[PDB]
């Protein structure tokens, strides 16, 4: 087992998550089996309790774990499945040793942060890195650890102490440290004192960096490389840079151009790892596929515009799996994507009195779009604006996908306007008044990977053809509210077909509307099962439908 | 409310606990109401799970809290009652904020060590210092906080960060810092660089010391004072020393000789605290009583020897409340005390084969003693040796006190040798063989302050006369095993009278033997209710009985 | 005497020098007498030995001290005269205590960085701040100390230790700390962890900041202020920002808008300083003059273009007094300035073979300009290019000023082309060949403030009219080479009049050419005597001449 810590810097926004995911995928090009662990200094047990306004969305695993967003970067670059154990936190590990001290496994000893908590962290990392995470039976060859927060924040102290010990409690040449660090530019001169201070803060904790990975708005000067490589122990080829490029898929090839594998191939002795003839082929094949999708982003120009309608769209981190799911679906179509970020509340007619500027801009953006997405996220702000987007998309025949809350919004819209029930509404917020036209109801969560069964007549639907006309689908759920199953037959008779349901019925999971080119919704989040070469099927439907060629996509999928 | 932090140094053994207790009692000489809080960086919720081989005994509060030993130093110097809340720990406060984050009181925010855990520590200190701790109704004027561990140990980090904030979240002139620090002597020269480094480690965390309290084997030189007072912000009178004197009761008067009150009277503005005419009298009266008991230790010479028989007596911290209870009882008698530390196992005849030196020395020490104590502490090592000490004390008519296990050992001894049941024994360790002559049985703990009722005939006993012939007694329990109540009438008929029991009966709490000058035992720990001017009654009995004058002590108590 | 330390941050490029100069001038608006001290962690005794390619130009004082560039910012904002003592360095103070230890003033004691070097720094600051620096007789009321380098660089250690002591060796309310710090913006979010780390690094040395002065590309958010004011001891009004505005003259009014005086007026108790009725008037008058010159930069639009021709013009810090002298002269004319930065070598015909792009651009820039400046700076690169600019300016009748080397270049040009001596040249670089047509000769430096006497016939010259037709001028020299006084009568007969000379003659200091609107040169640096309200006279000539209205400027000066 090899370990690669990706760590620290001078700021919390530095973009470690891209570099960790990219470093792991580059190791996967050698054919190595790879896994990864995110460490969070926060005291929350999970990202589930904490609101999307901080650290972006929670990400859902097959376990039903509501983990930190960074686990999604690993799953979509590395192709692996992660467990709720792969997101370590301060909350998890203090809860673990405190529950263990009350149970008494420490034999009446005094329990202390060193050695007992730092040995508990090292036991967690040793257990969790040996969980098999590919579909194959094998234990991973390499583990990427991403150390969240910044080095020398008091929040991090047990993890920087544990990782010092770990560099010896596992062999050297089985452990290596990448430090990620800020190189700000002032008056056009590339200033280095922030990264020199961060390299000292690592040495103060006994962590010694094997590569320094600069984050900068420029190519590093050869003087900027030398002034760091002379201050730190790293050689000139071990001062990595990652530029402020928009395409995060280019980062693996920007690291490969900087010869970063050729250092880790020595520094971790990756030639001593045994590999089969299948492994080297499936490794090199994966690199050629990534050269092709990045070539397609360099030379595809013909924009498809998708409008994304939701709360707090200024927090673009709040929708990162949607963004990445749309980008995978646009690459599969060989088309460039624009996302138009529509703050759903500004669509509402009250905005035309309160701030007439925001009203006209938000309705410009929505009218402009070749297809529409309503992305999910609980909370009562802007839902009539999201209902207005679903209405516009139904009436103007514009491709629509509704994910989680977006499906319920389309059901409420179709009830208010096509069934003509003018006060039909979500149970989430009006039930203090005990309303009879319930569109949502409660059914304390439904979470993680679940089976959807396609209902027997559904063979016609564009969405069931996108799932290869298979009878069942596996996707990740997260909801407490679902469509009222008393009203379902009214919608299924008026043409809004609930194409798929849970095994028990009375719990709707996919709809497609008869008489529209692509108007679809899902109760699950299709984003989380997206992979770079195999996009999320409902999103491959939406981004093909917006472009045209949805028939040719379905004809392809029938091979 | 005023706060006085006592803190840190270069080593964990430095003796903060004496200085905190002494500083608080000196503030009590002004008539101020005083309280105190111990902070422990360990992850244990309580000292109850952890074995006496580390940090000495657990101390029992009236709550039944098995707290850190340092709470006992506060109760016996300050005269206060502490709650299980007055011992803060890493385990307590991480358990508190983690349970609070799962309950969700933090409104979906990300929870972090700063500000959320440091604000939870500051809320704990603010709540707990306002608990009334004297017998009177009033809230305390001053709180002493003792910061356990050492400054810049990673274990301490949330508490040194919290206390920086606290210096502002409560006013300056309502908070002050005492730093306690090591001044080692090499070649007879008093070296200062360890304390200069500890003063820098405080400044690095933003904590600024108002007094530096040196711990040294000498009087500080005036150069040793100046070389510290020139390096640090403290004036010459704010460099305190506490010498390696044996009598810890002299420390309050050694601080008073160094004019330490006259600094805090300015630095905390203690003249602005309102005080009544009763308060100043009961304050100054308390100082004169302490001048008298310390004068008596300077001029009493006529030694009483008590042998203390138990496990691990090399760990003299394991019996600190016994030691202090014996010292209070010897001072009340105006007699000097020697304790003879007898490792109970060495009394056993197997020792005479294994190491004949340890056998003869341990039996020398036991034969030498004017009275005998068997102190408690669970675990099967040496119990036949403790039975042999109880036998010797019964047969030779030598004063005996058995506390907790020491009472059960005397019951087992009296059963084996006076009732003549040769295999009668503790249920604690032989019950894998299901023995019928059970002396102990289980009755998951009995803990904290409980009532003992004296059984109706008991008026004759020296122990009930020592409790003023009152019908009931309040003392602190800690046990899972008690005397088999089926066998009690056999002992009460053979003369081993169970003088006191729980309200329900079938649970024995005090015995006295008919036909011995003072042979007594208690199921409770009488040590924990000892106070400097009012010693523990069973121990005032033992140390009077060893000296003679037990009648005159009882005649006094009848006033 | 009051002290205001301006300090530190995360980077060496942060712009402390503007903030120190601006803070001092704002204190001068109260009428206080002000002075300032620059501390440099470098080991050079002076900036004289070190080449202009690092830390910009050396600045010349009236003493002849070749000081750090930052002393010029103080002289031109504060209006004061500085001595070579006002630039403290590591080289100066270690040379001082080492020479003092060899002389033995330390009475055979062991000499150490603390207390002896830190007390030597504190003695330097106490001596030097009491030097009178205005033209009046008074000792300064306030001293601004600028701490060069960054805090926690090992280079700085004696100065951060000395300044901790100084906060007590002078009273609190007579000392205050401004910390200047970087607030980088990433994804449009204003990240604060670099400044939180810099505030900890101050506390680690015992320096406590009274204001935090952010340097950022934006207005701080009110959340960005609160997240710093909650972490540090500073109040919300003590988190200062200085924006990336181009006009450094706006910074005093941006600090005044942030109410920064109203904090220091309390925190330094500046109302306790006695002030006369003249002082408050000359103080408030100075503020109104600064409101006017800044209003003129807001509403003047009619550009004058000056081409500056020299070595290494990419290092714009290399010519900072030229830049500021041109800006003062353009403000006095009520006209906006563009400087066109012409790398002098690119003008040379060899460039048209080597890189034809750089040739055409440099000759575009020179042809475009309303006036030309040749700025000084020793070294043989580009001098024929500077000769070509002097030729172009003479022949096309375009206003020309030559400063130091720029005068000698114009003398060489006039000799090569108007006297027709085709190989006449500088002695600086050809004298290995012992050439007879010497234009320069050596006359080991001439340095500091010196008298120029105007030669008797010179009453006609635009340059002597710009100096008010006074018979003598006081300006700062710096040169080893001067015009060959054997050839001077040839130039004075051909019309290139050496209008001014040293008292001894044979040493030429000003020329003006008969028969050109303004073609002038100086051996001294006129830049260094520029002040915001009273620009350098040769530069007020150049920037008026380029604009037209040179007659009206001279008519004004005759009042
Ligand atoms: N080298 C990079 N190139 C492009 N974008 C980057 C880069 N580094 C960081 N980012 C971007 O900055 C944001 C944060 O990056 P990332 O998640 O990898 O940082 P992080 O250190 O893991 O932050 P966090 O601790 O909050 O998870 C993301 O939007 C990411 O795409
Ligand atoms: N000034 C002193 N004079 C005499 N004995 C002292 C002194 N300081 C410490 N000691 C002794 O050293 C031991 C530890 O002292 P104390 O309990 O006060 O230290 P502490 O800092 O509180 O240690 P801990 O953190 O383990 O509780 C005790 O036996 C105590 O009596
Ligand atoms: N607030 C600011 N607004 C505009 N420019 C600034 C500001 N702060 C710094 N600069 C610019 O950055 C450069 C360096 O600034 P300054 O000389 O004041 O920094 P410094 O800390 O004194 O650097 P050094 O230590 O090298 O002297 C100069 O060009 C200056 O004009
Ligand atoms: O204003 C001043 C005065 C003095 N000094 C002095 O500090 C020294 C250290 O040099 P810097 O502090 O400029 O650091 P650096 O260039 O090595 O690092 P970067 O942050 O640019 O990567 C020398 O340059 C010396 O003149 C300053 O840096 N700035
Ligand atoms: O062996 C050596 C050589 C050099 N030095 C040098 O270090 C210096 C600092 O002096 P010290 O290190 O002796 O420190 P100090 O006496 O101030 O502090 P204490 O620890 O005794 O309280 C000077 O004494 C200088 O000679 C040593 O201290 N020891
Ligand atoms: O990637 C991760 C994982 C965990 N953490 C964790 O570290 C914590 C500290 O939060 P930050 O490190 O983001 O710091 P901050 O926002 O207070 O400071 P700025 O630098 O933005 O001014 C919490 O946010 C917790 O989730 C991260 O910061 N990043
Ligand atoms: Mg943040
Ligand atoms: Mg991340
Ligand atoms: Mg220990
Ligand atoms: Mg203690
Ligand atoms: Mg530099
Ligand atoms: Mg400067």
Numbering used by the authors:
A (entry chain A), B (entry chain F), C (entry chain E): 1 to 443, 456 to 571
What does the article say, verbatim?
CTP synthase (CTPS) catalyzes the final, rate-limiting step of de novo CTP biosynthesis (Lieberman, 1956). Each CTPS monomer consists of a glutaminase domain and an amido-ligase domain connected by an alpha helical linker. Glutamine hydrolysis in the glutaminase domain produces ammonia which is transferred through a channel into the amido-ligase domain, where it is ligated to UTP to form CTP in an ATP-dependent process. Budding yeast have two CTPS isoforms, Ura7 and Ura8, which share 78 % identical residues.
We determined structures of CTPS filament bundles formed at pH 6.0 to better understand the mechanisms of lateral assembly. Reference-free two-dimensional averages of bundle segments from cryo-EM images of Ura7 and Ura8 were strikingly regular, suggesting ordered assembly contacts. As we found for the single filament structures, Ura8 reconstructions went to higher resolution (3.3 Å for substrates and 3.7 Å for product) than Ura7 (6.6 Å substrate and 7.0 Å product). The Ura8 substrate-bound structure had the same architecture as both Ura7 bundles, but the product-bound Ura8 structure had very different interfaces between filaments, giving rise to filaments in register. To better understand the nature of lateral assembly contacts, we built atomic models into the two Ura8 bundle structures. Ligands were clearly visible, and bound as in the single filament structures, and the longitudinal assembly interfaces were the same as observed in the single filaments. In the substrate-bound structure, Leu277 nestles into a hydrophobic pocket formed by Ile383/Ile387/Ile412/Phe429.
